[PDB]
Design an enzyme around this catalytic site. Structure first.
Site, PDB file in Angstrom:
ATOM      1  N   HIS A  94      14.066  41.556  78.251  1.00 61.16           N
ATOM      2  CA  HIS A  94      12.701  41.990  78.387  1.00 61.16           C
ATOM      3  C   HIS A  94      12.336  42.304  79.829  1.00 61.16           C
ATOM      4  O   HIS A  94      11.290  42.878  80.067  1.00 61.16           O
ATOM      5  CB  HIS A  94      11.757  40.944  77.839  1.00 61.16           C
ATOM      6  CG  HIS A  94      11.776  40.868  76.357  1.00 61.16           C
ATOM      7  ND1 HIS A  94      10.841  41.509  75.577  1.00 61.16           N
ATOM      8  CD2 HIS A  94      12.646  40.273  75.506  1.00 61.16           C
ATOM      9  CE1 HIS A  94      11.137  41.308  74.301  1.00 61.16           C
ATOM     10  NE2 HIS A  94      12.219  40.550  74.231  1.00 61.16           N
ATOM     11  N   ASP A 120       8.667  45.041  87.175  1.00 65.25           N
ATOM     12  CA  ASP A 120       8.305  44.650  85.813  1.00 65.25           C
ATOM     13  C   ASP A 120       9.185  45.364  84.814  1.00 65.25           C
ATOM     14  O   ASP A 120       9.353  46.573  84.903  1.00 65.25           O
ATOM     15  CB  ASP A 120       6.841  44.976  85.555  1.00 65.25           C
ATOM     16  CG  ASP A 120       6.066  43.835  84.923  1.00 65.25           C
ATOM     17  OD1 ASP A 120       6.663  42.942  84.283  1.00 65.25           O
ATOM     18  OD2 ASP A 120       4.819  43.753  85.009  1.00 65.25           O
TER      19      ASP A 120
HETATM   20  O1  LIG Z   1      -4.730  36.080  79.684  1.00 67.07           O
HETATM   21  C1  LIG Z   1      -3.995  36.770  79.225  1.00 67.07           C
HETATM   22  C2  LIG Z   1      -3.026  37.432  79.974  1.00 67.07           C
HETATM   23  C3  LIG Z   1      -2.122  38.300  79.360  1.00 67.07           C
HETATM   24  N1  LIG Z   1      -2.228  38.522  77.999  1.00 67.07           N
HETATM   25  C4  LIG Z   1      -1.330  39.416  77.292  1.00 67.07           C
HETATM   26  O2  LIG Z   1      -0.030  38.993  77.711  1.00 67.07           O
HETATM   27  C5  LIG Z   1       0.842  40.118  77.667  1.00 67.07           C
HETATM   28  C6  LIG Z   1       1.459  40.375  79.045  1.00 67.07           C
HETATM   29  O3  LIG Z   1       2.616  41.121  78.740  1.00 67.07           O
HETATM   30  P1  LIG Z   1       3.204  42.053  79.901  1.00 67.07           P
HETATM   31  O4  LIG Z   1       4.274  42.809  79.320  1.00 67.07           O
HETATM   32  O5  LIG Z   1       2.150  42.874  80.612  1.00 67.07           O
HETATM   33  O6  LIG Z   1       3.787  41.095  81.022  1.00 67.07           O
HETATM   34  P2  LIG Z   1       4.742  39.873  80.789  1.00 67.07           P
HETATM   35  O7  LIG Z   1       3.905  38.621  80.830  1.00 67.07           O
HETATM   36  O8  LIG Z   1       5.535  39.705  82.064  1.00 67.07           O
HETATM   37  O9  LIG Z   1       5.949  39.626  79.770  1.00 67.07           O
HETATM   38  C7  LIG Z   1       7.482  39.968  80.030  1.00 67.07           C
HETATM   39  O10 LIG Z   1       8.027  40.675  78.748  1.00 67.07           O
HETATM   40  C8  LIG Z   1       7.312  41.853  78.277  1.00 67.07           C
HETATM   41  C9  LIG Z   1       7.813  42.417  76.879  1.00 67.07           C
HETATM   42  O11 LIG Z   1       9.078  43.075  76.856  1.00 67.07           O
HETATM   43  C10 LIG Z   1       7.568  43.061  79.430  1.00 67.07           C
HETATM   44  O12 LIG Z   1       6.551  44.211  79.256  1.00 67.07           O
HETATM   45  C11 LIG Z   1       7.332  42.440  80.847  1.00 67.07           C
HETATM   46  O13 LIG Z   1       7.571  43.531  81.948  1.00 67.07           O
HETATM   47  C12 LIG Z   1       8.084  41.003  80.902  1.00 67.07           C
HETATM   48  F1  LIG Z   1       7.947  40.607  82.253  1.00 67.07           F
HETATM   49  C13 LIG Z   1      -0.051  41.296  77.314  1.00 67.07           C
HETATM   50  O14 LIG Z   1       0.029  41.578  75.939  1.00 67.07           O
HETATM   51  C14 LIG Z   1      -1.445  40.847  77.688  1.00 67.07           C
HETATM   52  O15 LIG Z   1      -2.423  41.493  76.957  1.00 67.07           O
HETATM   53  C15 LIG Z   1      -3.248  37.924  77.266  1.00 67.07           C
HETATM   54  O16 LIG Z   1      -3.309  38.061  76.078  1.00 67.07           O
HETATM   55  N2  LIG Z   1      -4.099  37.020  77.888  1.00 67.07           N
END
Ligand SMILES: O=c1ccn([C@@H]2O[C@H](COP(=O)(O)OP(=O)(O)O[C@H]3O[C@H](CO)[C@@H](O)[C@H](O)[C@H]3F)[C@@H](O)[C@H]2O)c(=O)[nH]1
Ligand SMILES: O=c1ccn([C@@H]2O[C@H](COP(=O)(O)OP(=O)(O)O[C@H]3O[C@H](CO)[C@@H](O)[C@H](O)[C@H]3F)[C@@H](O)[C@H]2O)c(=O)[nH]1
Lengths: 450, 452
Positions: free
Chosen positions: B150, B357
């Site tokens: 991921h 990311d």
């Molecule tokens: O307070 C909050 C804060 C965030 N969220 C949700 O958490 C999710 C954050 O996912 P995002 O992909 O942006 O980052 P990530 O946390 O690093 O996850 C990894 O894995 C992901 C999936 O493959 C990848 O995109 C990423 O680059 C990886 F690092 C996203 O759906 C937000 O809407 C929330 O519901 N409430």
């Protein structure tokens, strides 16, 4: 007969102290002698200007004299020691020497300006040795001293490596004025530990054969001018904010960003209010104004960074999309606007860890609309607490007691807010800045000179 | 046939995140099992916790405090996470952490084994489970096993610094299929592999190393555009409806992520400072809100970045704030995802500028959530994997705080016609590669492989 005031900084062609000095000078006629602080060319004549009764007179200091006199001995030995912070003192001998050298420079430049039947009034800890230096040059004159900051008890004061010299030199004054009775008592106790002192009239003393008097003159405010400034029209954006915060009460503090002021502890108190009194969420706000003072020095930079961190932490924990609990502003505001802010605020939070007096406390009450006044929460370690007995007095070392005071202030009925405000206002009206200076000058005139 | 999915956390029925909807769509088509850590420490004796709804079964175990510290806090989040995000200076390699990492992978494999059937397809997720195919092979499992990473896979010059990089590469090759967010991640994996050992490659994506056959592929993770639009269009909770209305004359710049050093939050705050400094016409007329729930707060580097960020909020508000205007609203708080879609919709600018990311779903959520007839603007770091596909975003380099500031100014003043054009182009890309597509492609590719 003439009044010669000397004070480390002055204002030429205002604020609490300057209006008292100006009034004493208006009644007597005189001269106000002090530094005009920007260094760089010590070796020129005095910059003199004249009104009618009075003449201002200023001089510059070398960068060495400034580092050792003002930045080192005054602001990093005396200031911390006198506010009960020995852990912060940074004593080095070259700095004590520089302190004496500058008091001696100032005395050399002041000698010629003096006349025989003058009265001389010296201000604050930068000039503890100044009367000593005048007596050495043959000036017999009535010289009084006023200490604007606390005088520490022996167990603290005697830690200073040169305390015995400082004490000897202070007894060269004819009159020593202090903010509170405990400061006056602390000085006498320090003196009594070093040498025998003879007392005879509550407040007339001898030590090493040198005669002097002590007395308490708690500095005050100009309540009519504060009320005038406070009541004037808000500038547009502040009128906007007041009508936006109809249902939000404002807790307000302003001060120089200084470790004596207990600003981190204050933030912790607000946090404890938010933590334990969730009824207030979304309906109050604490605004701290705290412009950078002496930011060249480590202890002060440490507190600024701690406040930044704490504003972020607290707002990050308790904030909402539409509500920021803590407004921290590291910015200078004009005194006039601040008086208006005091009036429109609902609670004044003045809780220093140690303070000679604290004028903000008196200003806050003077500025209130007496028909709808805010509430003063005040630290028992502020010298103003001896007179502002109807403030909510708190111990800032007990953050939950500070929080409970804030809750009480926020819910206090109009009747009680009036009662408390009118009681403090009467006290600051009766011991106003005009009264302060007149008491000190009349005491000083009474002394038969040597 | 039956799909078995393993990931470090799972999600039983009773607030569905981005990856969870993909996994569940996969499992609802095939039927099967989702297996992983419960999130709880303590009481590891007791049986697996199993629940079952229709075609699916969820299964979790607890970990011991020591297992958690070495495998999750140390190796996963203090070695692998910083290394893969190009932060060698934060890696805390120690041998006990590595042994724990392997011990926990073996343990999970032992707990999983009794639950497998001969014909199961097995889909493993993320850097916590790099060794997991290997642990399964030595336990006799011949099944088709795919892995999806991921996060980014770093180039050799960075990956090779890991003292155990070699064992990691060897173990990754026991997967039949390895999936990555972007083509550069896939290539970086292959580059690392080629520097260790001879790899034979056909048609770019089919490989042999050490006599082990495997495939690689790129599957950029996506969102559910129709669900997000529905959630986003739904009424705000009354207190927030009130707020939206009170902000008529205020443009909102919004950001949301885990409080992680990969997300460049201090550099972002510095870009907002540069906006406020160099573009004073926005004073009193804009607001930047950063939502940043604490993540992995037991790990020293995470506590550091949190304290750094708090300092900057206080500093910036201290300098540009006014009595009646806070420029920067920082909330160290978790917000429900459904609510966030609605906040994205009412916002005018989405600021998503990570330093590194894997993809960044927030960027895709932001666009899907907009009203297509009055859409916000996405400002996006060229270092999010999403930038490969969200080409009509305002793409920026976060190392240049003035470029980010200029893009914020540009976003704040963009005409309706240009906002629609940029939004529609991004939305089309995310509709054509949605989370259903993502899972359907991965699963299809995994069914294709001929098991050993
Ligand atoms: O307070 C909050 C804060 C965030 N969220 C949700 O958490 C999710 C954050 O996912 P995002 O992909 O942006 O980052 P990530 O946390 O690093 O996850 C990894 O894995 C992901 C999936 O493959 C990848 O995109 C990423 O680059 C990886 F690092 C996203 O759906 C937000 O809407 C929330 O519901 N409430
Ligand atoms: O941004 C700003 C911040 C502050 N002020 C003004 O600065 C003054 C603060 O005086 P205050 O007596 O409360 O504190 P202080 O600075 O420590 O001065 C010392 O000396 C004082 C004189 O005796 C004594 O009360 C005190 O205990 C001493 F330590 C007060 O008149 C404020 O309105 C402002 O105008 N703008």
């Amino acid at each position: 007969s003439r009044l010669v005031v000397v004070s480390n900084r002055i204002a030429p062609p205002a604020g609490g102290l300057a209006v008292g000095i100006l009034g004493a000078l208006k009644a007597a006629g005189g001269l106000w002698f002090g530094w005009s602080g920007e260094t760089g060319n010590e070796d020129q004549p005095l910059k003199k200007v004249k009104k009618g009764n009075i003449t201002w007179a200023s001089f510059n200091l070398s960068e060495q004299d400034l580092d050792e006199y003002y930045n080192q001995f005054s602001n990093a030995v005396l200031w911390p020691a006198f506010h009960y912070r020995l852990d912060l003192v940074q004593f080095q001998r070259p700095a004590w020497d520089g302190y004496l050298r500058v008091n001696a420079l100032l005395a050399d430049k002041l000698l010629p300006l003096l006349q025989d039947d003058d009265i001389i009034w010296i201000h604050d800890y930068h000039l503890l040795p100044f009367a000593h230096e005048l007596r050495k040059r043959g000036v017999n004159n009535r010289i009084g001293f006023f200490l604007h900051i606390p005088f520490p008890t022996p167990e603290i004061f005697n830690a200073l490596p040169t305390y015995d010299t400082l004490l000897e030199q202070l007894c060269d004054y004819d009159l020593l004025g202090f903010q509170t009775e405990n400061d006056r008592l602390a000085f006498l106790d320090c003196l009594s530990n070093l040498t025998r002192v003879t007392t005879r009239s509550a407040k007339s003393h001898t030590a090493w054969g040198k005669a002097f008097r002590t007395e308490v003159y708690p500095i005050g405010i100009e309540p009519k001018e504060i009320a005038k400034q406070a009541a004037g029209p808000l500038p547009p954006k502040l009128a906007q904010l007041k009508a936006e915060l109809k249902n939000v009460q404002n807790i307000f503090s302003v001060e120089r960003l200084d470790y004596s002021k207990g600003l981190p502890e204050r933030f912790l108190a607000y946090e404890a209010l938010l933590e334990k009194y969730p009824q207030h969420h979304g309906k109050i706000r604490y605004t701290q104004i705290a412009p950078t003072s002496r930011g060249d020095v480590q202890a002060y930079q440490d507190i600024r960074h701690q406040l930044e961190n704490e504003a972020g932490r607290i707002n990050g924990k308790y904030g909402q999309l539409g509500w920021t609990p803590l407004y921290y502003l590291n910015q200078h505001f004009d005194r006039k606007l601040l008086m208006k802010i005091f009036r429109y605020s609902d609670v004044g939070l003045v809780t220093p860890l140690r303070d000679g007096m604290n004028l903000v406390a008196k200003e806050y009450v003077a500025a209130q609309d007496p028909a709808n006044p805010g509430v003063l929460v005040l630290s028992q370690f502020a010298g103003a607490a001896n007179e502002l007995t109807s403030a909510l007095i708190v111990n800032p070392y007990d953050r939950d007691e500070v929080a409970a005071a804030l809750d009480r202030a926020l819910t206090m009925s109009l009747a009680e807010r009036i009662s408390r405000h009118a009681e403090m206002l009467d006290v600051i009206v009766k011991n106003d800045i005009n009264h302060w200076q007149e008491c000190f000058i009349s005491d000083l005139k009474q002394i038969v000179p040597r």
